[PDB]
Design a binder for this molecule. Structure first.
Ligand code: SN0
Ligand code: SN0
Ligand code: SN0
Lengths: 321, 320, 321
């Protein structure tokens, strides 16, 4: 609730109502709590690339008067050995087991980004890495996208849907789209997780074989007919993700371009808004025209990433010992 | 004094008062440290940089600003620059989304985007730097675009004023041999600014290396290096790849007789040696010349902090 | 002592007693001097990789209210030509002779990391690069590990030994350990240098051939029998380093795994603490069990890097013109 010790799943945010309250409070008065994080240091660690999370999170920290240190492992640091009990006589000069505690020594709050490795479903879904940070960093840890979730993103999506909805409980449809490379299911999982927490009419549509883990799908409606799902929707949340079930974990089952959210599908919606977490591959995930259309709130959405981050960062600060 | 961007000498307005603030700040570096409080500067790099990279952060700090340095390609996603393509490859993100997005998290934007030498029009129409101006939603200042480098030139002006022995010195910009094809942004920019002064400006380069007229202006072009150097008070050496006709962005020569050495300096009125840096020793200039006491290369570089602080200040002062 | 103009060797710190005093003063009140470095800018330059020095030094600077700019040459900047009088018609666009002065132009204090290049002993041991910074930067320079020393690290090791010792003058044993790659002798040299400055019972143990330079070894006891050296020790400081003498400068003479600090050797010590500057290759330098044992103060040690840096940075500030 109001005792945030970490930020990885929607549960951590507590009551959505009051969470959204603070969100809009801050949208209105961006530097209202610029004094709260004074002399508090945030350490942002990146195991993967990032534009939005990278930029938005620093800004957020600044809104709170915090200190920010961005660390891109692999670049300026030493490669990390993730497995325990191995003889470190090669590629890796340092072991994750030392790295984590050490990083925790120089900051107050930690943000981590560690994409699913798609080498072993269990390792990814048990969220081994993000958890080792939680266990051994000795600091509050918030996700900048783990192997199976991306709360900071979803929380922002929530904020923008509330921000733009025309009715109390809109029809929000998350749709799969073709992509050339195998992507994590973190965003979809996370979106579903958050949408299920609302009372919106949530629908998930994807090709056969791309079923997401039940624990995330929840009791949301799954429609295999994209056109049917889109019917009368108020929000379209497009995002690609590699397979998850059985022998296809982390694999591309298809690149059926008929799923590319184009003008054809949008037409069937109730003049719905188009959303996407970004990056977005144009004419793969969505048409140039759709993303450029006025119903596309892609940027406003991205912008809200600063808010969700400022709210989470604030809560974390408020709970620092 | 309502600066909305900073890409060409026009943006600075009256040079006199611009130089005034420059020296004001040289004297009292943190005089306006309170001005940029709670204002965030986003520096974006599409190319390498030491001086611009360092000097601009310091400048922002002098104004009490927040600074975020972003090196695309490194921590971010590769950008697709062309519109209407099917992004099914190398690029995960399109510039059309990237720009607006970056603008979302800052108050002022600084961009560095070297000429790509793939198409003269694309470069000279300054497509990229302009798309930032058009879609970032924030004031944009150049950290060197395809055809200009105001921050650098403005600094060169400051140092010439700072060191000149007479009111209107003879400033000679000279080409020099280089192993790789370099943009003409620095030369173009220097010429642009020198033409704005009332100094005796002269441009000297090998045949074929003529810069665009709009930049050359009505400056004197001398193809005989030794003749140009005669009695000069300032030597501004810099290499640049060809520009005209079928040689856009190409190396026409590496004639080492142009390497600014002791031979040419001797003919000048004990002139100062200047260069924006990086500089390849014994290519652009002799070890001895750059190391000589007439070489104000560092003082020059140092002034990059001032030009940046002045520009950054003006931009802040005009923020809504 | 209160006239710090640089920080590269133990001499620069002055009286160890008062140095340790400030150290613990700051451990207790971390932001006590947060106002001292206001409007002062620190420039950290890296010619090599780093996690601890990279992170700990920024935090330190922040504790002093300073401004921090981290520069990783090679990455965002232009490759530097280190030799003078060459015709720069190749790989290098910029020369070190211009780079150094230029970097000094935009900051108040400079921190440099430049590992030994192992291309020429004299060049390394005369500390040419670190010195050129001192000579031409025009600013106070502190080492983030040069070719032959690493004061920031050693000073921290001192702090932690003082912090954990059970007696006034403990037996501290620095031990060599097998490694797959040729490492600088900067850490060993530096540790010896500092331990020789104390009145602890200092012992150095390494295989034949790995003798460190006399000027660093000082009059410390050198034991070629690891097990003998470990006997009754109170602190074990393990660290690998490539050869130094004669025709083997910067070369791996052996990878004898019998030196891997394991449970076998620890047993012979007076239940000694295990220390290491990190990065550490597990099961090469030290056993998983040893480093994970409770006698392992590896992290507390790393943590102290923030203190040593804050103290040094403070002293430097206090002496700024
Ligand atoms: C703080 C120690 C820095 C460095 N370490 C390395 O270069 C380690 C390389 C490796 O582990 O492969 C050294 O031994 O001097
Ligand atoms: C915001 C998170 C985006 C990330 N996507 C990618 O890694 C994109 C790579 C590509 O488009 O090639 C993902 O699906 O988790
Ligand atoms: C400020 C100067 C930037 C750049 N210089 C280079 O890119 C030189 C590259 C080299 O020397 O290899 C140019 O000519 O525009």
């Amino acid at each position: 609730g109001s005792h945030m010790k970490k930020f990885t799943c929607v549960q951590d945010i507590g009551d959505l109502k009051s969470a959204l309250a603070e969100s809009f409070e801050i949208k209105k008065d961006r530097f209202k709590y610029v004094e709260l994080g004074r002399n508090k240091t945030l350490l942002m660690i990146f195991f993967n690339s990032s534009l939005r999370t990278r930029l938005s999170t620093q800004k957020a920290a600044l809104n709170l008067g915090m200190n920010v240190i961005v660390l891109d492992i692999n670049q300026g640091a030493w490669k990390l050995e993730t497995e325990r009990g191995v003889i470190m006589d090669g590629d890796k000069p340092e072991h994750l087991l030392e790295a984590i505690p050490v990083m925790g020594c120089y900051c107050d709050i930690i943000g981590v980004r560690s994409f699913a490795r798609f080498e072993n479903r269990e390792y990814d879904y048990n969220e081994v890495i993000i958890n080792q940070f939680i266990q051994h960093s000795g600091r509050p840890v918030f996700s900048m996208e783990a192997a199976t979730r991306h709360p900071l993103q979803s929380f922002a999506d929530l904020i923008t849907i509330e921000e733009y909805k025309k009715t109390a409980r809109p029809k929000v449809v998350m749709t799969w789209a073709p992509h050339p490379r195998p992507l994590p299911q973190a965003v979809p999982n996370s979106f579903a997780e958050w949408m299920n927490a609302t009372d919106y009419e949530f629908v998930i549509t994807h090709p056969e074989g791309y079923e997401l883990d039940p624990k995330f799908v929840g009791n949301a409606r799954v429609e295999y007919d994209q056109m049917k799902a889109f019917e009368g929707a108020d929000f379209i949340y497009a995002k690609n993700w590699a397979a998850y079930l059985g022998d296809n974990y982390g694999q591309i089952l298809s690149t059926d371009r008929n799923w590319t959210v184009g003008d054809r599908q949008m037409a069937v919606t109730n003049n719905a808004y188009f959303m996407h977490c970004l990056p977005v591959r144009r004419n793969m995930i969505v048409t140039d025209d759709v993303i450029e259309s006025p119903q596309s709130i892609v940027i406003p959405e991205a912008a809200n990433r600063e808010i969700s981050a400022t709210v989470v960062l604030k809560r974390l600060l408020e709970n620092l010992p």
